[PDB]
Subunit: 295 residues, 4 copies
Amino acid sequence: SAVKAARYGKDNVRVYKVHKDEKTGVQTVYEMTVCVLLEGEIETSYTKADNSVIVATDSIKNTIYITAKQNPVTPPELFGSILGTHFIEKYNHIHAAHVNIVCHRWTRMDIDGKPHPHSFIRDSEEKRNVQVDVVEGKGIDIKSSLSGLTVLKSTNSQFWGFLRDEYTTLKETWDRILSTDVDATWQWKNFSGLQEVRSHVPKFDATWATAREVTLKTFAEDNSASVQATMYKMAEQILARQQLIETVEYSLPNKHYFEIDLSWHKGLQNTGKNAEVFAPQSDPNGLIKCTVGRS
Amino acid sequence: SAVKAARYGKDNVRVYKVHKDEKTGVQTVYEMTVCVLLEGEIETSYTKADNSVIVATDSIKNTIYITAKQNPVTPPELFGSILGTHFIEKYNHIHAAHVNIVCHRWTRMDIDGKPHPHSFIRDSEEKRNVQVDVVEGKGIDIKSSLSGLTVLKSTNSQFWGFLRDEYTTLKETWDRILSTDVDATWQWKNFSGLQEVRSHVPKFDATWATAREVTLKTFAEDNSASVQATMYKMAEQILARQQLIETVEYSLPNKHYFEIDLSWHKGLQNTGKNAEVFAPQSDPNGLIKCTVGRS
Amino acid sequence: SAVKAARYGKDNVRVYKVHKDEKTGVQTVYEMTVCVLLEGEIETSYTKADNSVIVATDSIKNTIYITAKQNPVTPPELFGSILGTHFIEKYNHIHAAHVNIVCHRWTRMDIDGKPHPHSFIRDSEEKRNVQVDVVEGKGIDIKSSLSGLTVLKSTNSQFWGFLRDEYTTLKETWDRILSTDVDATWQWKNFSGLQEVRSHVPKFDATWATAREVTLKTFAEDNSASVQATMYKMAEQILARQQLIETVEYSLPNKHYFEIDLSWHKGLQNTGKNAEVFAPQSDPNGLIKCTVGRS
Amino acid sequence: SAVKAARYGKDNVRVYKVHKDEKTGVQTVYEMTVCVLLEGEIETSYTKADNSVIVATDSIKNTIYITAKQNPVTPPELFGSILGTHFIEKYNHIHAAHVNIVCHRWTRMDIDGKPHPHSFIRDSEEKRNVQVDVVEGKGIDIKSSLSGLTVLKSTNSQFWGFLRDEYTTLKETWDRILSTDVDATWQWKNFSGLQEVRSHVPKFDATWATAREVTLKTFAEDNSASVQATMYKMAEQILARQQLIETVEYSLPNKHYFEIDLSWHKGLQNTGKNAEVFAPQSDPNGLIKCTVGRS
Ligand SMILES: O=c1[nH]c(=O)c2nn[nH]c2[nH]1
Ligand SMILES: O=c1[nH]c(=O)c2nn[nH]c2[nH]1
Ligand SMILES: O=c1[nH]c(=O)c2nn[nH]c2[nH]1
Ligand SMILES: O=c1[nH]c(=O)c2nn[nH]c2[nH]1
Ligand code: NA
Ligand code: NA
Ligand code: NA
Ligand code: NA
């Protein structure tokens, strides 16, 4: 036998950073969870017990805090690229660094209609993430994403005209609830290295904001023919608005809300046009995916 | 042996309700998870296999949907009281109904600066809850609460002057991070029955809003001497603003963020006045509780 | 306003301890999560910012590790009593210590039919817990429990003869699946103090084992008329087998498995006597509780 | 823009099946969670709102229950292959079916030293999984796995001789705790279709058992030089014992247990040879991966 693939490092490294503006007194916090896995000429640690090749995972954890101390942690696309570049430049035998970052929301509180200088609220478990793969000789590949964006519309969703055969019981509908947790990922064209990533820094936050805005607007305004049709409209718009994106991927659960027939109880009417009370279903759930790219 | 206490019913009943304004076209959704447990003359189901005394938990689930169909589901204090009153009035041998409700956030989306008619976002896992105990001959006891309100301030928190003995290693500090998940409960004076609960309906949402506002303001503005001292200031204000509240209880974890000494690496300075990067600690955590009532 | 109740301390303190037998070379590990909350004359930390009264929660965490270093951690009833007694004896103004312990399973591995000296497996998320309240002048109150014991029987469960009215749709049944997660708690008679707790040490593990054995046997052998009737039989036996127990409490969810009617598809028969494939329901669930004590 | 990739179906379909032996009276239960995603000529549902191409996810859910009704659900490799083959044969425009199955433990209870006929216990959250990709014209690809196997050894683990530079603080050690959650996957050589999968049925359970046995034995007996070195020994053995496996992949967290220096308290000795009480760390954690194949 032989090692066909190997990667190792530190996962779940929680990091917080505060920036303090001495002029204004305003403080801004950033909190993230970071994973860094390395690849390179490390097979012998597995096959020969040769630890000489191992940059200890504890050392990777130290490096993450040090890098956060010496560099900006925002946008995460930049931080991730700096962190990945560090490992492949620092260590001759390490040839790829894979950096995943999950950013947690700390939104400045408004107290009495004015932004507070140093207090924050976690407004939702929605995350902004990046995956950065820094590979020696092959540049920097970045996938950015939002996830945990949970939405619901109570009408203007339809689902009819689907295949019907001896396995089908679902009724066609022209008015249903649609609810999902949005996972959207946009993949950047490959960057030659850190200098190029730095040159595009303003695009990272702008594109994240555009992706979120397009998602929310389209979800709210599309009179939806299906999850499929609505997510395609979202991805289409993101690609149109940022030329440095190569592909947009969406993964959307269909979180079902079922009508409850109550007519068995005093002829109570609670279905179709009369449906007011529904039973949210924890499982199963539809799962709909698509990756959209350029013609 | 003898049955000393017994209660039974249905937990985790997810309920969604939509209200549709035909004039304006505006829709509003409510989603909750409900638990109803009953007590009464039911010992024989346990001791004699006498199921004749059991209102089936499946029937309790049906009743919850029916009651939501025929009544307002908001404020939850009212819905809970209606649901509990139903069981003790309907069934001669059932003498107490215990109703817990967790309300989930569905906040109307703003699209292009205007409130959307029928699309919503889950902005945070914060909940509004009620516990309603409806006991025959003893009225209606209601505890209202907010929970899962996660906040952080990056400065204006101190902790010094605590007991020091041979078990103490913690250093005194005059500037730290304070972060918590707020659980706050206010207990209403006992109500004689449903008519009285109905008569106070406007106070339920107002008091919930006041509790939340007081929590956020005090947390943000108090130059905090301890979690203890800050939570007391919160509870004091709520009691001052609503005379129908008997007690306010707070339970606050202290979610620690630890300085990371980096001076071992090139004399890098990251502690005290120089602390920028911190390690959020998943566990352990301080846990601080208090119940405040009237002089 | 006034402080009506207050308690504070450290939650989620993970502790592992290893015992090494130098003769045999055999090692045994214990892992627990501990919470200690204190009460006493501490109101002024809340009302006056008087930290002088606060034994820091960080110091409580240190004490837990120190106590585990100097004492046995098993049975947890003893460890908890030692830890609680420490705080009320050490500190004049602290008058109650509330200690909760959750013990995690590390079961010695059998390798080639023989018990391995120092390797262990987590065989299930089942826990053994204790709550110990050590109150100055009032002795030591101990509640012991098992939780997370998840079981299922595929037949020999019935449910018929329940109340039927205009809220009832559930059909009577003489053969169903019964599945639950067992939470069982036994409450010890009050102990005068640590010496008495020490004097009963052998009873703690024996009673835990008896409670578990009785639970499993009764669940498996009772042709069950209801969850109510089966849990009562369990509690009855535990009380009969240990005279130092005052009460036994059970809390059992009814985790429903629903028949799936498939007759719409080629007249396929999958209900009643023909039911083979079922849909486990994540929610809602029955919840059945009882506390049994002595005549 | 254009659809570059798309797949959709039903996730989180919980399925239970009971087999009843009429001769012996013995019952055996199986419980699983199933996901089926389809691919084929379905782009127009995304781009043109053409639902005509969509086999409804609700219909996929029906098919899963029907297939479980008419076929064995064990071994899951077979069930998955039957389920995937169904969709690509039944539907002309569907060309790939991706089936994931998670099997949940229901272990027959022993009551009084004898196996009970119809009662079961969930002994651990360990799972057995399969991923089956059934692709028209390309046969059946099966990856089998175990996950959630949580183990710990209290000694006979070492970690020394790793790279030391200006980022390193970790001390070398010749005796530590090693604890992990095992995720192991073995990939079968491609099968031509269902007939070939059927022909190898006895190998599926045998190989699963071998993988588990090898994992436990090696973990317990290896005097481990690193996680890397130990996992390689595991994968090497599995490949040696089953020629139909092409690759074995392991993903192992290093769940750290930290020494606690207590010497600040009365010179108490709790490090190195004296270490008895440790602090299990929830995060961060090492993460070590490798894929081993044939020379
Ligand atoms: O087994 C280990 N492998 C590693 O790569 C490592 N890094 N720190 N500790 C470690 N332990
Ligand atoms: O065992 C049961 N007890 C109950 O109270 C009940 N209600 N529905 N099904 C039930 N099963
Ligand atoms: O606010 C605090 N209260 C306490 O009781 C405590 N103990 N350690 N740090 C602390 N912080
Ligand atoms: O939007 C939907 N897409 C689907 O593929 C589907 N199948 N059932 N309901 C559905 N809804
Ligand atoms: Na390199
Ligand atoms: Na009554
Ligand atoms: Na005392
Ligand atoms: Na096909």
